[PDB]
């Protein structure tokens, strides 16, 4: 007693729906369905989502609302030995904001350049173009498309950089976009969930408005059904594939936000007797549904290119920034009223990353605010200093070799770090803290205990599900490379430190305050294995 609270449920839901729904719902999910043989991929997707994904999503939102405090204090009051988990989780989201915000900037950059008629990326006639330029996507690497050379040779200017060691000059139009992004995030998270809850009303809802338009505009185009085939046409042969179950497991986990401390932070502002089990199920469904819907949006346009524009589906069907910043814009340029589709598309991409970035920063702020009252009393100054650190370091990704810096963090930062973090989150709650003890916490909140189905997934399924993704991730590991460029072995090591920077906090904090308390284990051990009972 006591803590600040939400402005009412729709704010919380939109914040969670906002954080959960990002570009991964767009440039990733639809691709996996295509690669994994269509609606058949939904089987391993739905299964991995039900047993592994939701229970983890449910779990964080539960004890997030129950303990009513940030990730650091929450795990400190839960399993003081594992408090380091809260530290790891927070600084993981700290690393992500160094890069992930760049995607929003790129979206704003394309938004500014899309004001004009005759969109710049529709022609090889321009000044930044190579003789190897093509009108649209192809096979051979040496020859790129028009929309591809615009992104690389104009916006990113990645051609100037020979690698990560050379970042080249700082691009200020790009630095301007990054600053604009950090400004929006500041006047959002400025006063906290008071303003934050209201802003997500736009950022969360807007993407669905544009999705509906592009969904209609896409299906109104020739060959749109051909794209839907490449999208949802079932191959159940992939069901027996190991990589398919891995991709479904991986996507389901990363699509939802568990382990980032974001859900934990957002839920901590909930009313104690609020029903999380309803919110968790609702939010989860809306997330996957959005990906499914967006899938039709992409492949409707993708199939359109294969039909009218005469390009192989294998070439135009892709994932990540390449899809949204290159492939899709290329199709929009061909359509009538090009400028309109381009403007709303790029605005959607920005609003898709914004509410996702809000939760990320909030996870840091809330976790720290509860831990340290000094930055709890001073808010506006803290977030100003935080985003200042982001912008300065973020200038590294605004350079000419910025993508090389971006791609380094993308792979290493949160990739292998959070899997082990959430694995300890699952083990701590289900075993150290115990399931029967956790189930009782939920009963006191929502009125009823979790079904034994949820108990089993937390204690057994989740841990195996996590190691399953982690084990195969390590076995299928390869040195970091982008395009024809291979990262130096020192660059790889620099990313493992970042990946280890978080994870190491868990055993570190476990050892640190293990030597702080008196007595002898088990006595010292049992003190840290006991929750906060007063």
């Amino acid at each position, epitope marked *: 007693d006591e803590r600040e609270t939400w402005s009412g449920k729709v704010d919380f839901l939109l914040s969670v729906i906002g954080f959960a729904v990002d570009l991964a719902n767009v440039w990733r999910f639809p691709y996996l369905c295509y690669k994994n043989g269509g609606g058949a991929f939904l089987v391993p997707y739905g299964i991995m989502l039900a047993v592994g994904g939701i229970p983890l999503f449910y779990m964080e939102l539960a004890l997030g609302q129950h303990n009513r405090k940030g990730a650091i204090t929450c795990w400190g009051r839960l399993v003081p030995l594992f408090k380091g988990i809260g530290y790891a989780v927070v600084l993981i989201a700290f690393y992500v904001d160094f890069y992930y915000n760049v995607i929003i900037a790129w979206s704003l950059r394309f938004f500014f350049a899309s004001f004009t008629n005759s969109l710049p990326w529709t022609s090889c006639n321009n000044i930044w173009n190579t003789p190897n330029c093509r009108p649209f996507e192809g096979h051979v690497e040496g020859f790129q498309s028009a929309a591809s050379e615009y992104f690389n040779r104009y916006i990113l200017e990645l051609n100037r950089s020979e690698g990560i060691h050379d970042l080249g000059a700082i691009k200020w139009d790009m630095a301007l976009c990054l600053l604009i992004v950090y400004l929006i995030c500041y006047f959002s998270l400025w006063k906290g969930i008071s303003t934050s809850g209201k802003v997500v009303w736009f950022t969360a809802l807007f993407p669905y408005a544009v999705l509906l338009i592009l969904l209609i505009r896409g299906l109104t185009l020739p060959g749109s059904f051909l794209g839907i085939q490449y999208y949802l046409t079932p191959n159940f042969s992939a069901i027996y594939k190991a990589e398919v179950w891995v991709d479904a497991a991986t996507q389901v986990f990363f699509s939802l936000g568990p382990g980032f401390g974001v859900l934990l932070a957002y839920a901590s502002y909930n009313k104690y007797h609020n029903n999380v089990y309803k919110d968790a199920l609702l939010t989860s469904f809306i997330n996957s549904a959005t990906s499914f819907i967006a899938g039709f949006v992409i492949f409707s346009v993708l199939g359109y290119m294969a039909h009218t524009l005469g390009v192989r589906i294998e070439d135009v069907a892709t994932e990540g920034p390449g899809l949204v910043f290159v492939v899709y814009p290329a199709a929009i340029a061909t359509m009538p009223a090009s400028t309109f589709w381009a403007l709303i598309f790029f605005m959607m991409l920005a609003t898709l990353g914004l509410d996702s970035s809000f939760g990320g920063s909030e996870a840091i702020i809330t976790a720290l605010s509860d831990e340290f009252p000094k930055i709890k009393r001073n808010r506006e100054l803290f977030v100003a200093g935080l985003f200042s650190l982001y912008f300065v370091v973020g200038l590294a990704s605004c350079t000419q070799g910025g993508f090389y810096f971006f791609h380094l963090l993308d792979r290493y930062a949160a990739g292998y770090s959070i899997l082990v973090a959430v694995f300890f989150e699952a083990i701590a709650v289900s075993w150290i803290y115990g399931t029967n003890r956790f189930s*009782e916490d939920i*009963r006191d909140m929502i*009125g*009823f*205990p979790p079904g034994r189905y949820w108990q089993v997934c937390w204690r057994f399924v989740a841990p195996i599900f996590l190691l399953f993704i982690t084990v195969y991730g390590l076995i299928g590991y390869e040195p970091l490379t982008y395009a024809d460029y291979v990262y130096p072995s020192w660059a790889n090591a620099l990313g493992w430190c970042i990946a280890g920077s978080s994870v190491v906090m868990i055993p570190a904090v476990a050892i640190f305050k293990l030597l702080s308390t008196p007595g002898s284990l088990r006595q010292r051990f049992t003190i840290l294995t006991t929750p906060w009972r007063d």
Partner: antibody, heavy 119, light 109 residues
Framework: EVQLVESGGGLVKPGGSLKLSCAASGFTFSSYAMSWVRQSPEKRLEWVAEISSGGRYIYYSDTVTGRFTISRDNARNILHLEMSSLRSEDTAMYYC????????????WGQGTTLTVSS | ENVLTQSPAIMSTSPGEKVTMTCRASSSVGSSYLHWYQQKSGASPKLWIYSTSNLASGVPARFSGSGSGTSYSLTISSVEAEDAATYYCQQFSGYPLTFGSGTKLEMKR
């Protein structure tokens, strides 16, 4: 199947103290939460106190608050109600019930045990 | 405290007829948090209707729950002699938990 048996209780002088016990069987005791509900000689049902499945979260009525203590033994599956400074208004038949799911109300009730506070 | 009031206090009915007893709360109660209990003479109370609608195991279909907010009702389509007892409505919505005044159902002859 499920059976609850209230034991103890009887004549007690005003200001005195007594302990009631409920023997639970037929179900896992640690899983379900328990509550004490008393019915006065005027047949008015009044909820007394509720204990969690692990005996952590506790709730009392404003009537018996501070004068009553509800305990739990999950080893022997025994529910306990510790009374002190009993008044005449506390005279009723005390029931043992579960008590777990708020939306399902009280699953099963004991046969009840009678407590009479008089001089 | 949330005061649940039930009426009528005592009710006489001939077997086969339709009886309706209401429940009224000081504060609004969740429709899933309102339950009904049937206590026969010299016997312990028994869970009858929970969540305002759903019956319990062993409860005949002749019983039906209804209502919401501050007003609820229990209805017996065709009353039988074995249905004569005192019925208590109760809310789990918030602490302290409270039982209705109860409606005593007696058979008319």
């Amino acid at each position: 199947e499920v059976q609850l048996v209230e034991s103890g209780g009887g004549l007690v002088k005003p200001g005195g103290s007594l302990k009631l016990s409920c023997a639970a069987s037929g179900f896992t005791f640690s899983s379900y939460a328990m509550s004490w509900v008393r019915q006065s000689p005027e047949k008015r049902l009044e909820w007394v106190a509720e204990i969690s499945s692990g005996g952590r979260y506790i709730y009392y009525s404003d009537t018996v608050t501070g004068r009553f203590t509800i305990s739990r033994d999950n080893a022997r599956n025994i529910l306990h109600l510790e009374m002190s400074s009993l008044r005449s208004e506390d005279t009723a038949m005390y029931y043992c019930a579960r008590g777990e799911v708020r939306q399902r109300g009280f699953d099963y009730w004991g046969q009840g045990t009678t407590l009479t506070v008089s001089s | 405290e949330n005061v649940l009031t039930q009426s009528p206090a005592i009710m006489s009915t001939s077997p086969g007829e339709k009886v309706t007893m209401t429940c009224r709360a000081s504060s609004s109660v969740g429709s899933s948090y309102l339950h009904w209990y049937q206590q026969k003479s010299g016997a312990s109370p028994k869970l009858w209707i929970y969540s305002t609608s759903n019956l319990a195991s062993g409860v005949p279909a002749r019983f039906s729950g209804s209502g919401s907010g501050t007003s609820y009702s229990l209805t017996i389509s065709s009353v039988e002699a074995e249905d004569a007892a005192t019925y208590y409505c109760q809310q789990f919505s918030g602490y302290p938990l409270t039982f209705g005044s109860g409606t005593k159902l007696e058979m008319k002859r």
